[PDB]
């Protein structure tokens, strides 16, 4: 409207929102679809759901490789949103109990899930990179606000999906049975509308072309750099001052610098999967903690599961609260949060949140009687401080990480650093899956262990970020 914020981004978050909505509207019912429509084993349903989730988290690598090395972006976004819509059509077409049975349903559902994962993996990094591209490199202050609004749109979509999805699958009869066709059709229509709104702003975007087969050049440069040193019986200048400087006979300097920046950022991101895994282990253990505390609140009876909705909601309050106020206050004095102190402080806040959760668990355990009621029984409150702390940590880490990944990425490969971010998230989720089974510790000991692990991970990340040399 005024300046510094292109109209284009209007059709970059409204799309993102409309996408996240749809996604969360499909996953929420997904497991039930396996159990009560396809009538699958519990093990089979859980395994298929987890495989779909993992593929969704991992596909961002293929999405970015397609986007940056070829076809540019806004054409990978369009052509992968088309695949997303096709997968949605298949998935909603496989939930109709009229045609075929137990064979067409399974095949169509699996193909739709595969296509949905492929589309999501390539709509996720490319859309953020495109929205960032819409801003001039000079206007680095507005890009951070754009990324904050992007994250806010994602979280608003999540909250609205939680609040709206139970209405679709509640007491609806598609064809003499529960209406599972609608539960997938509505997300399909939402994704169609997201694609429509994104495409409507084609004349306004700032589509930058790709700089070539950047992935192939990067891999070849790394290969040559590692091969040159192998002077087993010789060698006078294998590669000095860096492990890439003497992969320079070929691969002109503009490519060596870009691959150097990529490798530096990857080395920085190495420890983030552990943080993602540890911070993910709070939507399950905190339910167990909530089940053991009072939830009447006098006014409204609050179930433990509903407490989950308190994390997205709080995010909606902190994204504008921080950016507009807290950060502003930090700028009053000489304090200079350089997008890497923000992430370290976020990790520290998450560690403190888990320590507070352990303290609350200890307080719960210290129960004694005076239907008998425990006098020292905690209300569902006292879970507010830990939710607030972990939510502040998540906001500060995620928004700053998006901005850092975009800002510290060479122009040729802007959308592969977003892929690296999402890949750290995916590996963290994989670690969560692997370590979920190993559960033999008390709740309080588990929480204190998670807090200590988060502290150590934050220490390692801070020590690695102190020596990080920013792109210039």
């Amino acid at each position, epitope marked *: 409207f005024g300046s510094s914020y292109p109209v284009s981004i209007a059709f970059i978050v409204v799309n993102e929102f409309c996408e996240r909505f749809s996604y969360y509207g499909m996953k929420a019912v997904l497991t039930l679809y396996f*159990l*009560y429509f*396809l*009538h*699958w*084993n*519990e*093990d*089979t349903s859980t*395994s298929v759901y987890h495989a779909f989730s993992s593929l969704c988290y991992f596909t961002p690598i293929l999405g970015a490789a397609i986007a940056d090395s070829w076809l540019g972006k806004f054409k990978t976004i369009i052509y992968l949103s088309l695949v997303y819509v096709l997968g949605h059509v298949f998935k909603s077409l496989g939930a109709i109990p009229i045609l075929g049975g*137990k064979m067409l349903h*399974t095949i169509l559902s699996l193909v739709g899930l595969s296509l949905i994962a492929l589309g999501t993996g390539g709509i996720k990094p490319c859309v953020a990179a495109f929205g960032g591209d819409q801003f001039e490199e000079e206007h680095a202050e507005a890009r951070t606000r754009y990324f904050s609004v992007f994250y806010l749109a994602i979280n608003a979509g999540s909250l609205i999906s939680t609040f709206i999805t139970p209405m679709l699958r509640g007491d609806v009869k598609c064809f003499g049975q529960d209406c599972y066709a609608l539960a997938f059709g509505v997300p399909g229509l939402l994704m169609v509308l997201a694609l429509v709104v994104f495409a409507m702003g084609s004349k306004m975007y700032r589509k930058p072309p790709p700089e070539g087969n950047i992935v192939a050049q990067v891999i070849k440069c790394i290969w040559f750099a590692l091969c040159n040193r192998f002077r087993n019986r010789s060698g006078d200048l294998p590669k000095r001052q860096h492990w890439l400087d003497w992969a320079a006979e070929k691969y002109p300097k503009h490519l060596i610098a870009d691959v150097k920046a990529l490798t530096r950022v990857l080395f920085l991101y190495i420890p983030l999967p552990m943080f993602w895994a540890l911070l993910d282990q709070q939507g399950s253990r905190w339910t167990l903690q909530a089940n053991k505390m009072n939830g009447d609140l006098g006014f409204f009876v609050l179930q433990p599961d509903q407490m989950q909705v308190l994390n997205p909601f709080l995010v909606l309050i902190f994204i504008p609260l921080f950016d507009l106020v807290i950060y502003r206050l930090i700028s009053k004095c000489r304090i200079n949060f350089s997008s890497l102190r923000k992430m370290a402080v976020g990790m520290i806040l998450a560690c403190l949140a888990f320590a507070v959760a352990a303290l609350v668990e200890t307080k719960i355990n210290g129960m004694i009687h005076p239907e008998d009621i425990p006098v020292n029984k905690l209300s569902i409150a006292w879970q507010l401080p830990q939710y607030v702390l972990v939510t502040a940590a998540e906001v500060m880490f995620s928004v700053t990480g998006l901005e850092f990944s975009y800002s510290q990425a060479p122009s040729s490969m802007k959308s592969v650093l977003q892929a690296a971010w999402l890949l750290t998230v995916a590996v963290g989720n994989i670690i969560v899956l692997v370590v979920a089974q190993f559960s033999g510790l008390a709740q309080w000991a588990e929480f204190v262990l998670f807090s200590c692990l988060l502290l150590v991970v934050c220490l390692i990340f801070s020590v690695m970020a102190y020596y990080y040399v920013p792109l210039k």
Partner: nanobody
Amino acid sequence: QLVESGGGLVQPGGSLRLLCVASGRPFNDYDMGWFRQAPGKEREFVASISWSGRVTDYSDSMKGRCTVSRDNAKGTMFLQMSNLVPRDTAVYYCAAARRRWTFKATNTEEFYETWGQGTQVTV
């Protein structure tokens, strides 16, 4: 393995609590199901309870209200029908399937690999 069953005659509008006890491998490895075979009919599906009992499903008929429960300690599973009608005067079978990965429907006799003998609940 070696599943069993227990039940007998009930009043026309009464209730029963059918049993199923496993006398072998652990009860935590088995997804269980209740079927019925009315005289001169086929084996219909009555209920299914997954390992750990976290997932429970009932046939479309589910005459009255049927509830399936199971405790893995001592390996014993219950079915609690409540609002029986002169119908459903069939023989009830308990079936067990070892946990595994399959695409076969959990509401079919093919999924279950060990069918124990059945009771003769009548009305």
